[PDB]
């Protein structure tokens, strides 16, 4: 965390760039404030490939059917196609997850955000 990447000290002067912050791999889910607030990724992404031929994510994040019971790993809302219809499995829109789900690092916000929570309009804390 350096010269307010927001304000820039006496501009163009010459600034030292802090070292890359490290990703948070501690597998703890974080907790959101409103439905539809994309969960943050609590684990690593690194080697995971998302391409025309493979989607590493869908390997762990899926729902079991054929009569069996396992713990759900994606919400069924990820099954609806444009038009809201519910397909029998994750729909291709939604295939590239990296577009909505972001992992996180140890980085101190350069400024506090006074966004408030729906219940108890108290500044959000996750």
């Amino acid at each position: 965390d350096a010269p307010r990447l927001t304000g820039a000290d006496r501009p163009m002067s010459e600034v030292a760039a802090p070292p890359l912050p490290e990703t948070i791999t501690d597998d703890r889910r974080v907790g959101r404030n409103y439905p539809e607030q994309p969960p943050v990724i609590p684990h690593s992404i690194e080697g995971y490939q998302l391409s025309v031929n493979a989607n590493r994510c869908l390997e762990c994040h899926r729902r079991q059917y054929s009569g069996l019971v396992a713990a759900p790993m994606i919400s069924i809302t990820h099954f609806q196609d444009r038009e809201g219809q519910m397909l029998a499995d994750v729909s291709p829109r939604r295939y590239f997850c990296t577009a909505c789900h972001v992992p996180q690092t140890n980085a101190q916000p350069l400024v506090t955000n006074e966004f408030r929570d729906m219940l108890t309009l108290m500044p959000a804390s996750n």
Binding site: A2, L5, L20, F96
Partner: protein
């Protein structure tokens, strides 16, 4: 508790969001399932719109450099009343407006301004201060595309629409990175590709990124060599005898472009002196179908391959797609082609492939130009917020247009200025030199966005003969580098309207109140008006001719015309407030919208009735009889095409689109022996431009805290560098210290490096070269030579 409709404040895609409101607070941001663009889906930045207006910095009071003691450029920054702020800001104006006059006052707007904010601005700058020195940040963005639009079609914006995503048979991405910059569109493209396995995607790029991860034909070419590839395909269409004759013969003309055009710099710089023919540039000169074909002949598959660096087999793959007269090609391009010193040519060349084959104006067959900002289309382009422009594709040059504007704006004849204003780049230069002495920046952070800041933008803002105002919602380096900073009501704190890349014009009411004393840019503009008088600013002759325009005050003349006052403080939806209507007695937006609307309506550009846009989630325009237009220039789809016609690019008189014969040329600056690396510059999913908004949303900041240099894993080992090393990206113009990141999302080719510009600590634009496409004047941020230590 209370959900309101609203368009995403970022992307040119234009997703619909449903803002959740409680106790005067936005407490949630969901996807609008009733919106055609996205249909309930947003991307990271979208869902986090809820946290954008809430950083603890939000400017709340105007800040002048010295409250009392007077005001000194090299001062402090002090709180100051609005009145005070305007008092000082008006005085500075009046002066400049008498020592050097209009060609010395200048505005720099944005494709992030609301439709009526860019309209109120155009009006104020021209009908008011009588200066066409108004240019937008869109100059760095869509100029190239817009410029080629007029040249090839005689009318701006695409002829297709997002509906093509579902109809296409195969997609070609010319250097785009939709995966990260137009996610929901990339989602829409991905759904088509993955859902119908016959579909084929080809992505071309300077480096490997998240987008060429869905590609079937993955091509990585040499910076700037896309020009050659484009011609090869034309040649291939022609050589294999697969031109659509009935179409080319009936709907096409040809032409040749001026060839030794010269990297839009200052006369003095070598490249321009050498540029025999930089005086024209954009010279057309008709031709022959035969001559074009022969020009394109030089670019053999064997040659194109040599210049790009792509195995010929891939170029054969591309060529063919653009050719089997059944593959509905759907070419998409963003800043790759636009921020190109030969961008206008590139745009031209893509259309050629489509014109030659007749693949245009049909569902699925379309050359779609993706637009970047939320309303670079809706506002900058359509309202015409560029130095040389007026509403609905009209130019300041043309007298008939000038007159037409004058008739609608209720002005005295010959009032509007005929001179072309200073474009973005020029504006910085004229600032450096001392030609523009009063400057008003709005809804942009140009001190970070603009090219070569150290050479010509920074000194220009700090030039003591200059006074600089910056309206913004957060700190920002540009503001830090200004003299007067005015606080703005942002996004949903003000009622507004935007226009997305597919001609979709959508509105939003004011859902919450801005913090402290901040007010919409609309207000700022309109209020600052109340200071000048028809005497003061207009030429005496014009006055003599019309007494009622003596005293008055730019406001009675600009916003109290009895045209813009037309509608009462009522007429504003019982629910929903409007600070710009509580102050003032009319309803600005409705007035401005409906006035501005009269420029189009009839001559293409048909906007729907103001009120309609509030009840619906946008309508793509020419909205004729309340019916939107998906595909333009097609009988049946477009109503401006007369029954017995078929197609008719009615922007052109003869109704034929131009095919330009143009030659590949090289970039302004290529790597040397001293500076061996290519400096590519761009963006990242998590951040929007300057990061003034996203770097404040915690999850986005945390997700990618600061800028980084993407490099090849081996180009690092060699220099004895590892991942995380603090490097110096160096140019003949500047240096940065970013940290190296190899093994990141962007997998660089040897000799190419990429750094995103969202970090103000890391101003890459100090490193960047000032070069533009000499026709559109759009600076090129995608390539220059850089060294790393």
């Amino acid at each position: 508790i209370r959900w309101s409709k609203a368009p995403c404040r970022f992307c040119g895609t234009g997703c619909g969001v449903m803002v959740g409101t409680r106790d005067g607070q936005v407490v949630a941001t969901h996807g609008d399932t009733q919106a055609e663009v996205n249909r309930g889906l947003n991307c990271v930045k979208g869902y986090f719109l809820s946290k954008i207006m809430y950083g603890e910095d939000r400017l709340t009071t105007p800040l002048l450099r010295m409250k009392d003691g007077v005001y000194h450029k090299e001062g402090e920054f002090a709180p100051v009343s609005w009145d005070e702020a305007f008092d000082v800001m008006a005085a500075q104006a009046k002066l400049v407006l008498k020592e050097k006059a209009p060609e010395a006052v200048g505005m720099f707007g944005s494709g992030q301004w609301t439709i009526w904010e860019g309209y109120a601005a155009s009006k104020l700058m021209r009908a008011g201060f009588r200066s066409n020195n108004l240019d937008p940040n869109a100059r760095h963005c869509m100029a190239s595309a817009a410029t080629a639009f007029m040249r090839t079609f005689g009318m701006d914006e695409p002829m297709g629409c997002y509906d093509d995503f579902e109809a296409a048979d195969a997609f070609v991405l010319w250097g785009s990175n939709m995966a990260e910059m137009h996610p929901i569109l990339w989602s829409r493209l991905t759904d088509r590709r993955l859902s119908h396995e016959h579909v084929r995607v080809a992505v071309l790029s300077t480096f490997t990124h998240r987008s060429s991860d869905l590609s079937d034909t993955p091509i990585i070419f040499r910076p700037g060599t896309d020009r050659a590839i484009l011609n090869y395909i034309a040649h291939h269409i022609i050589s294999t005898g697969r031109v659509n004759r009935d179409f080319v013969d009936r709907h096409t003309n040809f032409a040749l472009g001026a060839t030794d055009i010269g990297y839009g710099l200052r006369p003095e710089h070598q490249l321009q002196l050498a540029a025999k023919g930089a005086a024209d540039a954009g010279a057309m000169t008709p031709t022959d179908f035969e001559t074009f074909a022969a020009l394109v002949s030089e670019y053999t598959l064997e040659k194109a391959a040599e210049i790009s660096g792509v195995e010929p087999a891939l170029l054969e793959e591309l060529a063919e797609l653009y050719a089997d007269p059944d593959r509905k090609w759907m070419s998409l391009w963003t800043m790759g082609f636009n921020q190109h010193v030969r961008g206008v040519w590139a745009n031209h060349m893509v259309y050629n492939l489509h014109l030659l084959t007749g693949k245009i104006s049909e569902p699925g067959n379309s050359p779609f130009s993706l637009t970047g900002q939320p309303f670079a289309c809706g506002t900058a382009r359509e309202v015409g917020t560029f130095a040389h422009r007026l509403p609905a594709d009209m130019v300041v040059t043309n007298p008939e247009h000038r007159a037409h504007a004058e008739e609608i704006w209720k002005l005295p004849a010959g009032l509007l200025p005929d001179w072309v204003g200073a474009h973005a780049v020029e504006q910085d230069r004229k600032l450096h030199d001392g030609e523009i002495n009063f400057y008003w920046v709005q809804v942009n952070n140009n001190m970070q966005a603009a090219p070569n800041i150290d050479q010509e933008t920074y000194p220009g803002y700090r030039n003591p003969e200059n006074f600089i105002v910056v309206s913004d919602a957060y700190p920002t380096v540009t503001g830090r580098a200004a003299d007067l900073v005015l606080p703005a009501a942002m996004w949903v704190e003000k009622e507004g309207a935007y226009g997305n890349a597919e001609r979709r014009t959508h509105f939003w009411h004011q859902l919450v109140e801005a913090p402290g004393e901040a007010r919409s840019d609309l207000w700022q503009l309109m209020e600052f008006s109340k200071r000048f008088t028809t005497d003061e600013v207009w030429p005496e002759e014009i006055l003599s001719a019309a007494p009622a325009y003596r005293g008055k005050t730019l406001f009675e003349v600009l916003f109290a015309n009895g045209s813009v006052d037309r509608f009462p403080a009522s007429d504003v939806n019982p629910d929903h407030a409007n600070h710009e209507a509580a102050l003032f007695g009319f309803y600005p937006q409705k007035g401005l919208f409906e006035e501005y609307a009269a420029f189009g309506r009839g001559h293409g550009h048909d906007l729907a009735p103001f009120d309609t846009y509030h009840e619906v989630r946008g309508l793509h325009w020419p909205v004729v009889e309340g019916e939107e237009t998906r595909w333009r220039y097609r009988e049946g789809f477009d109503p401006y095409v007369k029954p017995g016609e078929g197609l008719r690019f009615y922007g052109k008189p003869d109704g034929r689109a131009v095919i330009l014969g143009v030659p590949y040329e090289p970039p302004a600056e290529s790597p040397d022996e001293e500076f061996g690396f290519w400096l590519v510059t761009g963006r990242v999913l998590e951040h929007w431009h300057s990061g003034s908004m996203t770097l404040r949303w915690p999850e986005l900041y945390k997700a990618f805290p600061g800028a980084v240099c993407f490099m090849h894993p081996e180009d690092a080992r060699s220099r004895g560098l590892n991942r995380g090393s603090e490097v110096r990206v160096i140019s003949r113009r500047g240096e940065i210290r970013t940290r190296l990141e190899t093994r990141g999302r962007n997998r660089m080719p040897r000799g190419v490096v990429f750094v995103p510009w969202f970090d103000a600590s890391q101003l890459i634009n100090k490193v960047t070269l000032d070069a533009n496409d000499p026709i559109s004047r759009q600076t090129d941020f995608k390539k220059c030579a850089v060294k790393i230590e």
